[PDB]
Write an enzyme that holds these catalytic residues in place. Structure first.
Site, PDB file in Angstrom:
ATOM      1  N   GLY A 142       2.598   6.444   9.475  1.00 54.57           N
ATOM      2  CA  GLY A 142       4.047   6.372   9.214  1.00 54.57           C
ATOM      3  C   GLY A 142       4.657   5.091   9.779  1.00 54.57           C
ATOM      4  O   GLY A 142       5.821   4.810   9.428  1.00 54.57           O
ATOM      5  N   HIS A 151       0.848  -1.220   0.000  1.00 54.41           N
ATOM      6  CA  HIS A 151       0.000   0.000   0.000  1.00 54.41           C
ATOM      7  C   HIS A 151       0.875   1.259   0.000  1.00 54.41           C
ATOM      8  O   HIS A 151       0.316   2.370  -0.152  1.00 54.41           O
ATOM      9  CB  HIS A 151      -1.081  -0.063   1.087  1.00 54.41           C
ATOM     10  CG  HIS A 151      -0.586   0.194   2.464  1.00 54.41           C
ATOM     11  ND1 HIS A 151      -0.844  -0.661   3.521  1.00 54.41           N
ATOM     12  CD2 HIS A 151       0.133   1.210   2.967  1.00 54.41           C
ATOM     13  CE1 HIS A 151      -0.304  -0.165   4.615  1.00 54.41           C
ATOM     14  NE2 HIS A 151       0.288   0.958   4.311  1.00 54.41           N
ATOM     15  N   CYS A 204       3.581   1.927   9.333  1.00 56.24           N
ATOM     16  CA  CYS A 204       3.433   0.750   8.470  1.00 56.24           C
ATOM     17  C   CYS A 204       4.814   0.277   8.023  1.00 56.24           C
ATOM     18  O   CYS A 204       5.734   1.101   7.826  1.00 56.24           O
ATOM     19  CB  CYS A 204       2.480   1.034   7.319  1.00 56.24           C
ATOM     20  SG  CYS A 204       0.772   1.303   7.868  1.00 56.24           S
TER      21      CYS A 204
END
Ligand code: K3S
Ligand code: K3S
Lengths: 304, 304
Positions: free
Chosen positions: B143, B41, B145
């Site tokens: 932030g 993603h 991930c």
């Protein structure tokens, strides 16, 4: 979202841990520059520990008696001195992994990370608070002495604790990195009882703010209070008195949530008086006091 | 003595974290050998996230669009591929700090350490469990991930989790390092509701054994039970069924304490039925389920 009891990343400290052996005693040392710091009780036979005279025991010690191993490599000890309750072993090699560092003496209520070590090897990391009675509630087995507590400000490690002692009640006592015990404790196997383990009120309030930020709001009530009224209830529940300094420190969390500090005090007052009624806050059934306001801001803002 | 929620020392993993940027999205990557692993993603605009076609989005991407920074140095991306829900960015430099490692897919109830990172920089470490509903209860801001979950066996890091998603209920979802989500979750901003968050019974029992080892024994009663009788009560309290496999795994703690597993089950049964009556166990007012039997043995034995 979410709120966890979070330790500092331990790598900078892992790079500093060494094994110190004196006779049959092995514990942990902290290697910074060309100095290894360890508890002075490394020189004691468990017998010695009942009534040790450290100056007299140290006369019998030479540099070559202090065996210092960094991973599987031996460090050469070229001098030793006693500072309060720590030994400083001067080695011939600067630790190449020495981070930027400071030695700080923390106040009760301040939190830090512990890197639990055995034979100079890290086993785990966890978050602690200096209790108001100057004990910590750690996880330390035999061999863990010289394990250290620290905070990190970006790239600077502030070392605040070195582990020395377990009290008969299974709570922990130790020193700053100048070798001064926190609280009244001594490195002697004697009757040492901790005082009242009061709750760190300003930390509870911080954690209630953390709860609101993370969507746990059921405990917010319609009430306010005053510092004096709150403090009467705090005293009854063995909570630390709340000062205007604490109120000032919670200002940023107040601002972020729009809940006045004294309103949050009135929520906490009702929780003390009424209990949790089987409910939880941030997955806890008791009021958590090992997050500082600074911790809550840091974790809620994602500082690295 | 003492028992803490303890994470693995994070240094070996800190050495693997990098920043990955695609357009205006920055998150974390895991750099092992000459491969950077990150959530796919990273290629999405928050708009894309509503109904993303990753294969179609990826056609528009080139190696030079994936900006990978390790500390303040840029890595050169010489290839990229999608594996399930992760990207594998091939870089021209092997990570010199690559530890011995494995990719493992854990089972519900298994614990691991998370190194929470932002912009490739570690912010903290905490201990998690894969919940029975295949969520984790983490601490993750925007932030975070590509932050990873891991276990360490002496010098081998087993990577088990990479962070992808927060559900509307503020619980977390992610993948193994082959990019396969734990549970039914998808990397799409859609209605995803977690199932029942049951209690990990075998972990509670482990932690009750930890309690006895550390001198907290008030909850030990005169009773025993059977797996079937216990399981009727477990089901009523949304506890995971206890199997003979769980009983077998608790054998060493049984042996160490001399408390038969089924006796400890009968203690747990009374705690479920009666509550804690305002008492604590190892400083908790609820029954802790994020220690495995292996965790309790490790922490109680001081493995490094
Ligand atoms: C009392 C501390 N001084 C001990 C010593 C002796 N040597 C050669 N290095 N350190
Ligand atoms: C579908 C994944 N392949 C993309 C690609 C193209 N190049 C030159 N390197 N990686």
């Amino acid at each position: 979202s979410g709120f966890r009891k979070m330790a500092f990343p331990s790598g900078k400290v892992e790079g500093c841990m060494v094994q110190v052996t004196c006779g049959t005693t092995t514990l942990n040392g902290l290697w910074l520059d060309d100095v290894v710091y360890c508890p002075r009780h490394v020189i004691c036979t468990s017998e010695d520990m009942l009534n040790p005279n450290y100056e007299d025991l140290l006369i019998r010690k030479s540099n070559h008696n202090f065996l210092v191993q960094a991973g599987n490599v031996q460090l050469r000890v070229i001098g030793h001195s006693m500072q309060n309750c720590v030994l400083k072993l001067k080695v011939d090699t600067a630790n190449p992994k020495t981070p930027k560092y400071k030695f700080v003496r923390i106040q009760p209520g301040q939190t830090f990370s512990v890197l639990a070590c055995y034979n100079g090897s890290p086993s785990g990391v966890y978050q602690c608070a200096m209790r108001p009675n100057f004990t910590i509630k750690g996880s330390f087995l035999n061999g863990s002495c010289g394990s250290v507590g620290f905070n990190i400000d970006y790239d600077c490690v502030s070392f605040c604790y070195m582990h020395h002692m377990e009290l008969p009640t299974g709570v922990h006592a130790g020193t700053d990195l100048e070798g001064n015990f926190y609280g009244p404790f001594v490195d002697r196997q004697t009757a040492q009882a901790a005082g009242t383990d009061t709750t760190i009120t300003v930390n509870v309030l911080a954690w209630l703010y953390a709860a609101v930020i993370n969507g746990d709001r059921w405990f917010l009530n319609r009430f306010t209070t005053t510092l004096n009224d709150f403090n009467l209830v705090a005293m009854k529940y063995n909570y630390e008195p709340l000062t205007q300094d604490h109120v000032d420190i919670l200002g940023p969390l107040s601002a972020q949530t729009g809940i006045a500090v004294l309103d949050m005090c009135a929520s906490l007052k009702e929780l003390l008086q009424n209990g949790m009624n089987g409910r939880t806050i941030l997955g806890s059934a008791l009021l958590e006091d090992e997050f500082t306001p600074f911790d809550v801001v840091r974790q809620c803002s994602g500082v690295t």
